[PDB]
Amino acid sequence: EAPAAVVTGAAKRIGRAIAVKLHQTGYRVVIHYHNSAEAAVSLADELNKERSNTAVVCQADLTNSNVLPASCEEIINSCFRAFGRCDVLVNNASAFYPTPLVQGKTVETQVAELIGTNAIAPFLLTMSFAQRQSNLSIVNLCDAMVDQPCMAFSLYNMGKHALVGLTQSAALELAPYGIRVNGVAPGVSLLPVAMGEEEKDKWRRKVPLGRREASAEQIADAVIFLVSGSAQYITGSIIKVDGGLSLVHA
Amino acid sequence: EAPAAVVTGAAKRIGRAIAVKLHQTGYRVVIHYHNSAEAAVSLADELNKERSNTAVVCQADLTNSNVLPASCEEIINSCFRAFGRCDVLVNNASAFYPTPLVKTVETQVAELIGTNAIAPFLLTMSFAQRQSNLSIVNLCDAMVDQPCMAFSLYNMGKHALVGLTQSAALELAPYGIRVNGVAPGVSLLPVAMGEEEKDKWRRKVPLGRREASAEQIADAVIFLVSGSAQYITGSIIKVDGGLSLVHA
Amino acid sequence: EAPAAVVTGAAKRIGRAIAVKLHQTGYRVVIHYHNSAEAAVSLADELNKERSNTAVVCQADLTNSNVLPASCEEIINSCFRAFGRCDVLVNNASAFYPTPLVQGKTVETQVAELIGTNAIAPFLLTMSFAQRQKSNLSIVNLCDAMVDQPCMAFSLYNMGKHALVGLTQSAALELAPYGIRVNGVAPGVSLLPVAMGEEEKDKWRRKVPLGRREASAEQIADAVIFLVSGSAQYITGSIIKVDGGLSLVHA
Amino acid sequence: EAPAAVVTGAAKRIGRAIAVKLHQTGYRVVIHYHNSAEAAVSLADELNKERSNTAVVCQADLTNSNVLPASCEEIINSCFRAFGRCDVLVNNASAFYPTPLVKTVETQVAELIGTNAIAPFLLTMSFAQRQSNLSIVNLCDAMVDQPCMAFSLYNMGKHALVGLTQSAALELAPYGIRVNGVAPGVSLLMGEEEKDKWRRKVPLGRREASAEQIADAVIFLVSGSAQYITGSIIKVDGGLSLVHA
Ligand SMILES: NC(=O)C1=CN([C@@H]2O[C@H](COP(=O)(O)OP(=O)(O)OC[C@H]3O[C@@H](n4cnc5c(N)ncnc54)[C@H](OP(=O)(O)O)[C@@H]3O)[C@@H](O)[C@H]2O)C=CC1
Ligand SMILES: NC(=O)C1=CN([C@@H]2O[C@H](COP(=O)(O)OP(=O)(O)OC[C@H]3O[C@@H](n4cnc5c(N)ncnc54)[C@H](OP(=O)(O)O)[C@@H]3O)[C@@H](O)[C@H]2O)C=CC1
Ligand SMILES: NC(=O)C1=CN([C@@H]2O[C@H](COP(=O)(O)OP(=O)(O)OC[C@H]3O[C@@H](n4cnc5c(N)ncnc54)[C@H](OP(=O)(O)O)[C@@H]3O)[C@@H](O)[C@H]2O)C=CC1
Ligand SMILES: NC(=O)C1=CN([C@@H]2O[C@H](COP(=O)(O)OP(=O)(O)OC[C@H]3O[C@@H](n4cnc5c(N)ncnc54)[C@H](OP(=O)(O)O)[C@@H]3O)[C@@H](O)[C@H]2O)C=CC1
Ligand SMILES: Nc1nc2ccc(C(=O)NCCc3ccc(Cl)c(Cl)c3)cc2s1
Ligand SMILES: Nc1nc2ccc(C(=O)NCCc3ccc(Cl)c(Cl)c3)cc2s1
């Protein structure tokens, strides 16, 4: 049997690069998506063509609500249903937008999305992963800039901080079960869709190492390392993949 | 006119000590509470006996829900209606219990993330929007990177509060509102905890082998709101007697 | 009687502001200086005119060498000789200059000054202070809020300030059983270099979120005063940033 | 031809594991040593037998003296001499012993600050000066924020090494030289009952890290899979640093 992995928000961008690279390493993959139905199915088709029966999709809103636990349970369940095991969880899915403290989503909704996807869903997915339980491991996508945050991004920042706390707490608690829990913290990687090219180059020029953003593959590379046999004593660790960005003063 | 302060969970223990010290410092105080009505009123009466019309109480549940934003807006409002201004917010209220990975889970999330993180954020928003030496102090936790076993949601909330501290410091600094934290290690231990178990914690503290008094925590809060902290924002002061420096 | 404090590099700038504030709080002070003799004696004079017999000077190079331990021992001894006690040590003295990796002091000299003043002398003074102990004893170390986002080409300075964090933690742990607290104060941008030009100063000022200005020497001293006070009696191993939010600002 | 690595203190324990793994990965390697000539040569023998003329040794004392600079220049040199290039520097060599606040102190400084911090800084300068996937890996310590009682100078030096890692990453990024750290917890350990005490504290498997586990992290950091990673310190501690008092 090949080991199996769940990757959240795996339809596009970094999650996709992680799913692809896990697959290329021998994993069967559950491709979680929320809205990117077409891109999801397209990836699974591409992976299944490469080796049949090695990729499924699973749809779920990771917004906080009273039913998020059941949705997270379902994501993990889908991996056992498809593949009879679940060896790796990658908590990649993420909402990211400004929530200024000083003044068309309600604040209730902003909290639900930013805290639910970035922190609560990871926690619930971790809980379901552990409960349904080898080289078992969880990788959380954190954020190298969490201590030098973007202005007006307090809820996102709060969620990413909470994710660091989850990384530590679950590493401690799940170690006796042989499950390792680690983090990968991008600096600037795949830049947003609705962002101009002056503004892209603004960000690029701040990166000491090469004056450019991370490829999604460069982020995936770190994920690969942490799940691998080369990381069997690593737990509770967060690896920044930021080209020095977090070292740069204002 | 005397400045005013809101202290959440102010009825008992650390928040009580904070409210009293701010009062003794010359502040008028909103004593926020959840269940502890009798304790909150009795504190208010004592402070008002010391100085007339300087203390009011305000009831609210800080658990995460669709109505928490309204609740927090009202807390801040209560300070303005009582005293005509709101100079200081102390985010002290906290839920703290284990949530093992292996009450419903939704309730646990709502209580531990709502009280520890989301309500502070909502209160911070309301405080800033309704605007001197304005400042916010959040009660953090010195042991957040060396957490208690099976306290993941608690720890996530306290980490989130560190993020809020930093993020709000950055964003509110142009308005002249400072935002800082106080991170106790072991302070007031549960009353009902056995002395032999309290002693296990006490013995771990390098500095004097005892827990912090509530007054010692309040002392750091007083500093951060004071004119001696006018350039300090986005700082978290550990008040932990060296406990976080101690290896396993 | 009145408590006594040693403040290193106290002739000018932040060290002076710390000595002054400790003095105004009722402390007797040793003003340590290296080169700034005129300025040291002037300050002691001012303080002595305010209350007599309350300020002494003490000269010492804090560059690392085989005699640095003796020099640090002597600084501490100066306090016991003048005032009969030593309650507070402020490690303020600091060398600060670029040491580029890829490149007229020798490298030997750079290491001795930047690592000596910023880390080894604090460690030796800490040892001497604690050993001489026979109340509210504490040590405050002047750290740097920007140690994790350092200036380009300042590796030795940054290494010494990182060592000083390590000293702060290690000494807080070890000395707590003796009742000695050890904490730090970490400025961001405070008094800018005397040599720096106004346009350069203003570039730095505009980076500070809280007020777009540097900390005053007094504002730094305020935090020192808090940590030595009875208001900080349970605080040890803490480093308080006094930086106006500067360390939170991304590139 | 094939890339070349320097590993300091590579004769035994953690440094040897790093040396072997880099060799296995296809690096030509300099095995630096202070005292352990026998061990160094023996390792050299083993690696040359697998692949001819791909491992040399280098003597240098890394204590803090007026000659440390020259020593560190020599070490980097010997890599360019043997192999005509130097792709990777692993700063592994390290001293470790208590220095209570309550050997002359300056030997202590020269060892604990000298070997642990100043020589890395000097080797970094020489490595950089003489310049691809170039990078430097510094052996840090995961327990730096919760230090052993009475280990102030040691702790100070390891904190200084974090400072160097960050400052050098920033400064050398323009030249395509990455600079990173690996922070072991309890690895190869002292009595046997004392050692057991430590093992039981570790969340992940109640045992010390093998030297090879440390070396694995180094390998990752030098590899093409880490081409965007600089200024990062990877803990390899089995979760020990997460455990409270
Ligand atoms: N990109 C960067 O430069 C950096 C990224 N990171 C972190 O790395 C990770 C990957 O980054 P990146 O690829 O840019 O992320 P994206 O912003 O592209 O988001 C990843 C996926 O998250 C999913 N998602 C969003 N909201 C929800 C929701 N309510 N329910 C379920 N899924 C949801 C989306 O799925 P769908 O499309 O199917 O709706 C989306 O495609 C994230 O955790 C991010 O925070 C860290 C810092 C830098
Ligand atoms: N004591 C210690 O050793 C430590 C404390 N801290 C932090 O210090 C701060 C003060 O500590 P401490 O006094 O021990 O705190 P407590 O655990 O005693 O709680 C403080 C107050 O929080 C309020 N609270 C709890 N749940 C809710 C809720 N759902 N809605 C509204 N209010 C609620 C309660 O108000 P009411 O009684 O009126 O219902 C309670 O009196 C906290 O933020 C805590 O996490 C951090 C480290 C250790
Ligand atoms: N100023 C700022 O913006 C910032 C300051 N800091 C820290 O705050 C503290 C105070 O800063 P600031 O007042 O600007 O410090 P200065 O740069 O003005 O230096 C203070 C004193 O250090 C002494 N000193 C320098 N080299 C030696 C030596 N070899 N032997 C003995 N004494 C020596 C000098 O004494 P003398 O004049 O007698 O020769 C000098 O007056 C320092 O530790 C500094 O690193 C941190 C970050 C920002
Ligand atoms: N082992 C552990 O549990 C821990 C490891 N680490 C770090 O991992 C690395 C490896 O640790 P470990 O293998 O135990 O190291 P050791 O303490 O065993 O020493 C490593 C090597 O350093 C060399 N060395 C020591 N002093 C000098 C000197 N003055 N001049 C030149 N060379 C010198 C020696 O080479 P030679 O034999 O030729 O003299 C020695 O074999 C170190 O950086 C250490 O701090 C971090 C925390 C804990
Ligand atoms: N709102 C609160 N937050 C906190 C955070 C930490 C502590 C604390 O340190 N309590 C004592 C130590 C301790 C550790 C572990 C457990 Cl099960 C328990 Cl009942 C108590 C106590 C509280 S109360
Ligand atoms: N002993 C001293 N230590 C420090 C540490 C930091 C600073 C400081 O922040 N100075 C202003 C920033 C700065 C940045 C770059 C350069 Cl060339 C210079 Cl002359 C100064 C100044 C000093 S002085």
TrEMBL record, chain C:
The modification Cysteine sulfenic acid (-SOH) is found at C58, C72, C151. NADP(+) binds at residues 12-14, 34-36, 61-63, 92, 94, 157, 161, 188, 190-191. Signal peptide: none annotated. NADPH binds at R13, I14, H34, N35, S36, D61, L62, T63, N92, S94, Y157, K161, S190, L191. This is Pteridine reductase. It comes from Trypanosoma brucei brucei. Pfam families: adh_short_C2. Substrate binds at S138. InterPro entries: NAD(P)-bd_dom_sf, Pteridine_reductase, Sc_DH/Rdtase_CS, SDR_fam. The keyword Oxidoreductase applies. GO terms for molecular function: nucleotide binding; pteridine reductase activity. Belongs to the short-chain dehydrogenases/reductases (SDR) family. The active site is at D144 (proton donor/acceptor), Y157 (proton donor/acceptor), Y157 (proton acceptor). The keyword Nucleotide-binding applies. The gene is PTR1. Keywords: Nucleotide-binding, Oxidoreductase.
